[PDB]
Design a protein around this nucleic acid. Structure first.
Lengths: 94, 62, 77, 46, 103
RNA sequence: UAAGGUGAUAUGAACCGUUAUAACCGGCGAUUUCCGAAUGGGGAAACCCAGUGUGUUUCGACACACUAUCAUUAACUGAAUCCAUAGGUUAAUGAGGCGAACCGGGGGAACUGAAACAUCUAAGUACCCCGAGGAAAAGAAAUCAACCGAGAUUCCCCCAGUAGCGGCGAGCGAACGGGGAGCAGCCCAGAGCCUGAAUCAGUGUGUGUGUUAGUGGAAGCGUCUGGAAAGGCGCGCGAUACAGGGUGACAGCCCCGUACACAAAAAUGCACAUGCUGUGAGCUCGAUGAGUAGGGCGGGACACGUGGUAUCCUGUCUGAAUAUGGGGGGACCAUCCUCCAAGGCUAAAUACUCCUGACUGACCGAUAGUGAACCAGUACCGUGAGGGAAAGGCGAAAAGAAC
RNA sequence: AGGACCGAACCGACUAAUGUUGAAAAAUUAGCGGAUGACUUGUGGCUGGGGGUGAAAGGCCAAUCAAACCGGGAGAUAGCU
RNA sequence: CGAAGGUGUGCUGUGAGGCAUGCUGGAGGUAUCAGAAGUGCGAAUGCUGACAUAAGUAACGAUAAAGCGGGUGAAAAGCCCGCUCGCCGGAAGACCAAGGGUUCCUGUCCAACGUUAAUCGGGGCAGGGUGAGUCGACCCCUAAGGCGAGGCCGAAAGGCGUAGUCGAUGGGAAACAGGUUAAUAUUCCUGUACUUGGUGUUACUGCGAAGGGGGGACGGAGAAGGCUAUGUUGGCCGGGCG
RNA sequence: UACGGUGCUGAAGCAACAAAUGCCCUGCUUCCAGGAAAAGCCUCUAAGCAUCAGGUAACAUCAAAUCGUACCCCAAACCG
């Protein structure tokens, strides 16, 4: 049983995009931004407990940070994890 | 806040910590979208969790 | 290495002075020989890598005192 | 023409990597020299 | 340990506005103060569409060195220096001339 | 300590605080991901894979602790083989790696000079390795001296480029003695008499003095030029403070400071004093470091290159005396003088600065001074070890040019 | 069956031309030799400098080889310019 | 009421030089007599930076090739759309490993990069995009080889090596077809499967390795026979009568 | 219809012949130069476990984590 406070730290932010909205309205899958070290079980448990929704399966991928250029200095954005949480049929989420 | 919190039991500190963490999660989710217009609350709740954790380590195991 | 277990002798370095006084570096190794000593007190054989001078000291002092010295010096046998 | 640098990350790490340097005394001396000099990237490893 | 504080009424000692008096608006960390309506500069404020600022030749106060203003002693009508002393175990400021506590 | 803050480019937004848990500084704590001695096993560094035990479980699984190797000590166990030993398993303690220079030790060149070069020099230098400390090493005469005496070790100035050594070439180069800095003497090879008696080390408490934040800290106005006065011209005042920095041009009196006088809840350094623990002091008798000193052979260090070469160390072969004895006094012998090796410890004078604070310069001022005044061991070059730049100033204030 | 024959991929470089501040610090075009073998190639490893490796040219050892490269002795020495 | 520096002019000494001053500059300079030097530059195929020269010359990178109409724009031979032409087609097409690390897609901009113009780009800025029980890595297993408890050897550093433990380029379990995004798809969705481990009920009963055996498990060349991917032709279906 | 594409419906969907360097084939024939290792997998028992643990068959349920997945890949993106 994964701890509650750990669940309270797994989810970072909802990912907002055209593909995300399309997935939400067509495949009942929400795209969330999660912690880089989170496992599928932790993400599933965190969504099921904190949002009170039934999760079918979780798909994750690691997004590489882009190498940007602030003026003349070359810098790199932070890597982040992205999770496709597929809610069960009939469920609704904000 | 530290003085007020010091006259509390270990289980009271734990439930207070859990309430603070849930509050922090709601604030973080609210701040992700543009709904939150009070940015100082994130730092506030973070320092509160820091204080409670500090007091927990101070009381338990010492 | 080439180290006498009892006396602590080890290879030293020197020269090979020729007739024309040319000096080339050389070494002097100890005359090491592995030998089994009869420890009457323990009623067994202890094999040590000793020099000839080491054998002479073991003969003069007795094997018991030499083993005591080895134990004090932390040498394993 | 085949140039002298034919890259391979596996060979690169196995030849000039941090563990390869720390395996021997001389590699650690190289690391010590670079730490004294203040190099940003100690070894070839990414 | 600061001699000049927020609500102090000060008089300018040197510069183009020498002699004039005013209230300190806010003290900056760099050792400079902004005295109300004294060191007025004309800034050519550029328009910005967001936040709905029209953009014009605005006039506003510019900072001035603390070394150029002295506290004003209303009783004597002259500039004065600030000294520190303890009264009831609480550090207070006093005018160097007339040696009375600054309210 | 405080009326101002939420570090910088770097504004903006949302806020905290104004008489005291806003912020800032300091003491002691708490947390301290992963890699790295890396230490549970592995590895292409910042990643992969576990085992045991104790808890929870909404039975899906979670959290915490321990598990590297070696040395020493203790317990259990245990072959060939009877006892035993080797080996194995626990537990406790310690070590490992990094760091600029100094120190001691184990190895150790060549370019060069000799106008070539091999002896010799460069040189026990460069470099590699091991070990330790704030210093290290050495250290209390088997030492010099010369018939008079001195009195541990270390460092500085003379002696002295002397006496010597040397293809007697190039070069190397003392010591005796004198003047100083600093000064300290003890213990084990063994017993009795009085019993804890000097001293040292560890751990507390107390005092003094610092260190890590700080507090108070004097005395100037008018006028002229000027964008602006600290400048010019008058008249004052402070000074145990006219060191320095900043302020619209050059400020003792505008600000931060300086001279001076104060200050620690907490931690810590150094001198003391004292409590506790370990340790012994003094007297009498006894003992005086054996494969050792010396020798044959081959080297090395002494200024000394085997020379007539004393002295010290030993790779190899031998080998005493032992207080009625032995070493040294530059081959060696006699006389005489001086000392007691083959067992240890020891502060100060001495060497150096990765780092911290204060001060100083007939030291540099952006092709100079560190390679680096500037986001520099960076960009870039190279597989890699490694090499390695260029690049500072608007203005007093952005008032950085609305239209 | 064959270190057999003709001939593509693949490996190599015999002749000529061009290019020689080149498209290229050795290549392009037209021809050419081997093309089931002593062949050729991908991935990983091993052999280190007076050393390696060489069907042997003192060839090759990161565009550098009758002794690699980097740091140090080192501002070697230079009766020479 | 204008310092050093910079740039002209006049005067002066035998000379290195000196003095005064117009303009620019905007804050330091320094008599005399002494003192110390990183003390005077044209040369070193000297070092660093700047700028000429050849010269608006050579060149603009396969002789596979371009022509036109419309669109955007300040401007189109090069960008977009449309009709022709040409080139590769055992590649100059398509998918991977190695290597690179956001160069992928969308909106926007032309200062610098593209050997020309540029609205275009692998260029700048911002946003988006990588979904796995079955693909690959991780994991179990070893080759060459590395490290190596104890161990042997070596002045020290260290060399070799046993038990072990790493090391794929080889051995080991399982997924296909269709559709969809601007950018992902054997990963998403639909339909149909398969594999290996725990647990839990029922039925049956000798289980157990660090050991033994089998298997994994292996060379070069050559010759048919059966197939398939795939292609041609006929039939069928839809369209056509130039 | 934003001229980019999106939505709905949908006939035939067979046969013969040729044929691989791909598959049967880790095969067959033949030759000398005589052609990896270990694990997964099947089986056998030693200590031990004695009606326990375990094993195999069916059913149900749970689990399969972590990292890569864009783009070039005979090239304008790799090595020059």
């Amino acid at each position: 049983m994964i701890r509650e406070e750990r669940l309270l730290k797994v989810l970072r932010a909802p990912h907002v995009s055209e593909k995300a909205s399309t997935a939400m309205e067509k495949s009942n899958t929400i795209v969330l931004k999660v912690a880089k070290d989170a496992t599928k079980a932790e993400i599933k448990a965190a969504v099921q407990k904190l949002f009170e929704v039934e999760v079918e399966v979780v798909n994750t991928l690691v997004v590489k940070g882009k190498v940007k250029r602030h003026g003349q200095r070359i810098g790199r954005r932070s890597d982040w994890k992205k999770a496709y949480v597929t809610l069960k049929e009939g469920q609704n989420l904000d | 806040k530290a003085k007020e919190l010091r006259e509390k039991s270990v289980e009271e500190l734990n439930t207070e910590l859990l309430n603070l963490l849930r509050e922090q999660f709601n604030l973080r989710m609210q701040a992700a979208s543009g709904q939150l217009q009070q940015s100082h609350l994130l730092k506030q709740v973070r320092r509160d969790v820091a204080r409670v954790k500090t007091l927990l380590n101070e009381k338990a195991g010492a | 290495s080439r180290v006498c277990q009892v006396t602590g002798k080890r290879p030293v370095t020197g020269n090979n002075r020729s007739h024309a006084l040319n000096a080339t570096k050389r070494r002097f190794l100890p005359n090491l020989h592995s030998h089994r000593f009869w420890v009457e007190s323990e009623k067994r054989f202890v094999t040590l890598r000793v020099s000839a001078k080491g054998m002479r000291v073991i003969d003069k002092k007795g094997i018991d005192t030499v083993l005591a010295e080895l134990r004090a010096r932390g040498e394993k046998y | 023409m085949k140039r002298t640098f034919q890259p391979s990350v596996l060979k690169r790490n196995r030849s000039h990597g941090f563990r390869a340097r720390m395996a021997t005394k001389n590699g650690r001396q190289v690391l010590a020299r670079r730490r004294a000099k203040g190099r940003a990237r100690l070894t070839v490893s990414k | 340990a600061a001699k000049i504080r927020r609500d102090d009424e000060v008089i300018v000692l040197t510069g183009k506005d020498k002699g004039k008096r005013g209230k300190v608006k806010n003290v900056l960390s760099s050792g400079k103060v902004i005295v109300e309506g004294i060191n007025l500069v004309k800034k050519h404020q550029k328009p910005v569409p967001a936040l709905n600022q029209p953009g014009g030749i605005v006039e506003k106060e510019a900072a001035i060195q603390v070394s150029n203003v002295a506290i004003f002693n209303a009783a004597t009508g002259k500039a004065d220096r600030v000294g520190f002393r303890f009264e009831d175990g609480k550090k207070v400021r006093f005018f160097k001339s007339n040696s009375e506590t600054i309210k």
